[PDB]
């Protein structure tokens, strides 16, 4: 499709000048620079913001983890060797 945007005169001119410095036309310049940005954002790991209460609990779990229980151990011993 198309990208329709309203940009200030100072911004349009600056994109024009930079595209000019880069010996490339205005469409390849904007686009070829913004997909790698966009690709970095979508491939980045999801961030899970914890509250204070959950941080405390998670730090404590990672410090002193519980032992594996009967259900986990049973599943582990059934797991096939691949």
């Amino acid at each position: 499709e198309r990208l329709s945007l309203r940009v200030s005169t100072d911004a349009k001119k600056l994109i024009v000048r930079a595209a000019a410095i880069q010996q490339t036309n205005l469409t390849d310049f904007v686009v070829s620079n913004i997909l790698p940005v966009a690709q970095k954002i979508v491939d980045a790991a999801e961030r899970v913001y914890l509250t204070e209460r959950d941080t405390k609990m998670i730090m404590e779990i990672l410090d002193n983890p519980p032992a594996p229980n009967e259900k986990l151990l049973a599943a582990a011993f059934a797991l096939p060797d691949m």
Binding site: R47, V48, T51, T55, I58, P68, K71, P80
Partner: protein, 175 residues
């Protein structure tokens, strides 16, 4: 008792996704329409439990992706030693068993199998825990049975540490 006549593989072109039905519309849709694209082109990876006789038949699958827990400022932690702002984990986003194979312990084995895969990957990229996405209370209660702990806030998420998982896989000889 537990069905053990299956092997694990990354989802590929060969596997029979159309025959897979777990009774949940969205999990079916992911496997059938989105799992392969995300596996080959994205950060979400999907692994399938395949029958050992007919090796295109999917008995179930899980998907895993990378995530980070952002700790909040807590009294005393800075002094406590080395820390990190963004603690790496792996999100177990999906876990599903085909209706024709439910009640045979395959779900539980896939969770250990996802743990095994994430620990092995974590050796090369970092990770301390599975962060588990639960659809509803009943699924959450199911994961809690394995020792996953629900988060207080955002309560349909549970944490299962690699240490806990590793002890179980170590004891059984899978790691």
């Amino acid at each position: 008792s537990m069905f053990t006549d299956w092997h694990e593989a990354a989802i590929g072109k060969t596997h029979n996704r159309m025959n897979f039905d777990c009774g949940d519309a969205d999990l079916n849709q992911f496997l059938q329409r989105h799992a392969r694209q995300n596996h080959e082109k994205g950060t979400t990876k999907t692994y399938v439990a395949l029958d050992n006789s007919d090796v295109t038949r999917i008995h179930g699958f899980y998907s895993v992706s990378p995530a980070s827990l952002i700790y909040a400022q807590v009294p005393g932690a800075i002094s406590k030693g080395l820390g990190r702002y963004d603690v790496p984990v792996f999100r177990l986003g999906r876990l599903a068993v085909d209706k024709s194979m439910q009640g045979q312990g395959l779900g539980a084995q896939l969770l250990l199998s996802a743990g095994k895969r994430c620990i092995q990957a974590a050796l090369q990229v970092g990770g301390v825990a599975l962060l588990i996405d639960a659809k509803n209370k009943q699924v959450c209660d199911w994961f809690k049975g394995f020792g996953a702990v629900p988060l207080n806030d955002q309560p349909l998420s549970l944490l299962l540490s690699f240490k806990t998982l590793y002890a179980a896989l170590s004891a059984s000889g899978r790691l």
